[PDB]
Design goal:
Chain lengths: 156, 142, 64, 142, 142, 142, 142
């Protein structure tokens, strides 16, 4: 159930009864990294760890941007207006806010595909909504904390 | 305060108090370029070298606007004000909220003017402004 | 014949240091006033926050 | 009085009384460009700067017409009139009704002439006109 | 007498009596361009202006022909006649019957010559002719 | 009263009451040069030195005008007046409003005359005037 | 120690101690080019020849960075340090671990600066640095 539109929204592939006559459905179509290489690598020491020699273990996390592509469908007698409000709500600020390092990038073309379901032309609409957000992970890695160098002049 | 994804919804530009709203489509709608090269290396006939650093801290900015944008009205009023004889600064400054990257200037001046093309669809209107000093802001959030 | 000691107020607080800061303050106030009156509204977000920050970021540049 | 969508059905151009009708396809059929740059910034070897503003308020306009357009007939008569020896102004002015954007001039002159290409299909005919003064109109409806 | 659709079957060109038949494919097979610009606007440092009109009424024409066209034979005979030493006018004139658009000249001269390329298929042969005077005809049927 | 940008729209020149309007294009349309050097340093065979200062406070001015300018008419009347036998001063004075830089003289005289070139476009007409005294004005606004 | 496949995960670049991380997409993200040609062959009118070898051992490097990269912050601090008046070397050196191909320099200097384009998506920021000496390392693992 989205805050922008006043209707009920549900997940893509469930096994429940159709909720009401007007409602929505969101599916995840794909996602991918956006740039070829990383932005930074964040190193952080694990809280209260030990690698066997009095050294706290080090965890590294890459940071790259990613793109997620969803598939939005609205079923019933108000699909076009409900998706038009979503398209026009992507421009105003303080409204299109998402919690963590997430950004709505673009809302795509909106098509209408009425379908003859259950002895009645069921109005339908569908679009694509794409987000944009950084990447988080963490893997344990090893670090240098000393050096050694030897210098010689071959022939004095 | 994680370094969020880039978005045009967090970039803010101010031109003499009022904001800039109507911008054309494209990967380059507000572009600032420095005046001249930072320096010049001179290598002599023997192999020695000498670097020379310039004192020219100036920049130009190019803004692309739709034919229907209040910033276009503001700029076309400022152009006529300059043509009449009045000459003032109208500071311009722009920044990105995600990384504090951008810059500011104190006194700009209209340097170029767009071409009024009507045709069958909408066309860009490009304005070129020039400053005598341009201070970038250091991106502190990387 | 000329003025001496540079019009101090305390041990090493000279008059011009007060005058310049007062000028900076009285300039930023005027420029902020001239910003609510030109634009209709300043929204309550980062977009409007940087718009207000644009005034000191120009006064400091003009002062340096 | 909402700022309606742009359309070529609301743009009006007048060339010496009569209208302009036959225009070629494309996103640029009537394009006006200013004479020279508005100004020039000069920065010295020390870092100071000085801006210089020009007094050249002149413009040129390019019109693209089909090979069969009454405006083409009018222009090719005016060209022959100039070649004969007569020299007059024939004011040209154009505007968009949706935003009052455009301009006007008082005395123009034919500067270029098209190339008569026959080929297998229709080809553009481009005319270039030049004025000594060009007054844009301020878009009041944004 | 309605302004019918354009067609290459109504364009007639005559080169020294005989017609022109073999023309290459393309949207530009016979193209005439004027010698120089019609005029020049000069704006001084104060803002005044002065327009200058030229007396050069001359034109050049470019004709594109297939490697097998009787006009190619005629032109390559005329070229050899010029090379021998004889110099004459051979008037050329062309027109469109749908709108009476086109022009005529009294004395032309071969100015360029084509490049004989054999290759695997047929290639264009371009001839460039130049006149000292060129009188366009006013399109009276619009 | 900030030191505004330079512009030719704030420079005023007066020649015997009436203004100067028609000026040719270029970075140098009104140029004034002093008569002789300010001084001369003489160093002897031993190393001592002596500076000598002249009493010649005189200047010449060069004005470049279009072939169609009322100032050209005024100057060509004054030249004929001098040729007839009448000899008078006709004071000339010019100044820039942005910095109060310029000068004035009390009695000038036509020294040179332009060359009447017709050609294909417009050409400059240069007049050279000479004074016996020339007082510059000190630029008080920097 | 087989000559493994090439990968960007084994190339290391160091700019004044800290590493370079944020690099734009493309087959060319760090490119170094020599100053001038290695030599010049001069052949006389008789057929003899003479080769001339230069003493200019200098190079320039171009780095392409995303708008959000800590190296961008470091470089934009160094640029302001140079503009203020301080002038230092900040050595840069880069190498490939698979074949020991690359080079190093002792004292570089910022020569160019990027253009701040905002637009609708992210754009490259290109920095150009110049050295007075550049020592390549010989690829010992082929």
């Amino acid at each position: 159930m989205r805050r922008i539109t006043g209707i009920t929204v549900i997940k893509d592939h469930q096994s429940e009864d159709r909720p009401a006559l007007p409602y929505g459905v969101v599916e995840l179509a794909n996602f991918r990294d956006l740039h070829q290489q990383v932005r930074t690598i964040h190193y952080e020491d694990i809280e209260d760890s030990d690698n066997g020699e009095g050294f706290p273990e080090v965890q590294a996390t890459p940071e790259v941007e990613q793109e997620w592509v969803f598939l939005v469908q609205v079923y019933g007698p108000g699909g076009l207006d409900y998706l038009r409000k979503v398209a026009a709500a992507f421009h105003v600020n303080q409204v299109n806010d998402l919690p963590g390092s997430l950004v709505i990038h673009e809302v795509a073309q909106i098509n209408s595909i009425p379908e003859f379901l259950g002895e009645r032309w069921e109005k339908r609409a569908q679009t694509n909504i794409t987000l944009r957000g950084m990447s988080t992970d963490g893997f344990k890695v090893d670090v240098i904390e000393q050096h050694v160098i030897n210098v010689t002049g071959e022939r004095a | 305060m994680a370094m969020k994804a880039y978005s045009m919804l967090n970039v803010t530009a101010t031109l003499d108090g009022r904001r800039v709203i109507g911008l054309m489509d494209g990967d380059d709608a507000i572009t600032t370029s420095p005046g001249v090269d930072v320096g010049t290396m001179l290598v002599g006939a023997d192999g020695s070298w000498l670097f020379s650093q310039t004192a020219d801290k100036s920049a130009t900015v190019v803004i692309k606007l739709k034919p229907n944008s209040p910033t276009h009205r503001q700029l076309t009023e400022k152009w006529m004000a300059q043509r009449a004889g009045r000459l003032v600064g109208f500071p311009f400054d722009f920044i990105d909220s995600a990384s504090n990257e951008g810059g500011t200037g104190a006194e700009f001046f209209i340097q170029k003017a767009p071409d009024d093309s009507k045709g069958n669809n909408a066309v860009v209107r490009e304005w070129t402004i020039v400053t005598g000093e341009w201070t970038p802001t250091i991106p502190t959030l990387l | 014949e000329f003025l001496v000691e540079g019009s101090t107020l305390t041990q090493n607080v000279f008059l011009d240091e007060i005058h310049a800061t007062d000028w900076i303050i009285a300039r930023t106030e005027e420029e902020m006033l001239s910003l609510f009156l030109n634009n209709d509204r300043v929204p309550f977000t980062d977009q409007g926050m940087q718009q207000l920050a644009s005034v000191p970021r120009a006064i400091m540049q003009l002062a340096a």
